[PDB]
Amino acid sequence: EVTTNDGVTTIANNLTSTVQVFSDSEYQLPYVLGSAHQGCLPPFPADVFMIPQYGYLTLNNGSQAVGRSSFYCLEYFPSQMLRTGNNFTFSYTFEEVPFHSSYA
Amino acid sequence: LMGGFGLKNPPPQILIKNTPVPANPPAEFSATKFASFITQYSTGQVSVEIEWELQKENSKRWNPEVQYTSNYAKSANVDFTVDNNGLYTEPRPIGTRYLTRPL
């Protein structure tokens, strides 16, 4: 947690603050992934990266909002509070997607 | 292309027909088939009972959906009902696409 006291940032370690993590494993959300954006894991392993921001687009009549425009509140999902000692794990198994033809 | 369920083996055609009951034949035998039957018709009841399989929604939409509602107003006649002399009038075509799944 950073304190910019008198123009000097003094980054202080906080121990009781949490971090919410949930994996949207039922697909109630807009799936922004696969739109070829930045903010991935970096190519080279010795790189600190910065996490993207989750925004989503819905239906519009221009820059208006039709009555089908859904709003998704993301604290209305069960997240997982993570202190400085906990960890988030889950597992996933892909479908029987066909092999990518890596031949000519 | 008109919408619906394309079935390879659809519900089978149920065909119905009054059995021809002839009128009085002449006393001598005739080769020609029949030019005179008894005019008749049938009536009766018929029950069709289709069991459907529904797909319950699994949405995490926040704001309310757009759903098919009746017009709440002082109206002259109630929609999808009978009239002053009993004519069932469907006022408008009702689709089925009112809910919102994300793409």
Q: What is the DSSP letter of A6?
A: T
- The set of long-range contacts for B67-73, using a CB threshold of 8 Å and a minimum separation of 24, is B67/B98, B68/B94, B68/B98
Resolution to one decimal, Å: 3.3
> Chain B contact for A76, CB < 8 A?
yes
Question: Quick one: closest CA in B to A78, which residue?
Answer: B60
The shortest C-alpha distance from B97 to chain A (Å) reads 11
Q: How far apart are CA B40 and CA B48, in angstroms?
A: 26
The shortest C-alpha distance from B93 to chain A (Å) reads 20
Query: Residue B62 to residues A30, A43, A103: CA-CA distances in angstroms?
Result: 13, 37, 46
Q: Tell me phi and psi for residue B26, to 5 degrees.
A: -75, 170
CB < 8 Å to A76, chain B: 60, 62
| Helix (H) or strand (E) run with residue A80 in it | strand A80-82
| Whether A76 and B100 lie within 8 Å, measured CB to CB | no
Q: How far apart are CA A70 and CA B57, in angstroms?
A: 15
Dihedral, A44, A45, A49, A53 alpha carbons, nearest 10: 90
Question: Quick one: closest CA in B to A69, which residue?
Answer: B63
| Helix (H) or strand (E) run with residue B3 in it | none
Give which of B96, B101, B13 is closest to B52, Cα–Cα.
Answer: B96
Experimental method, per PDB record: cryo-EM
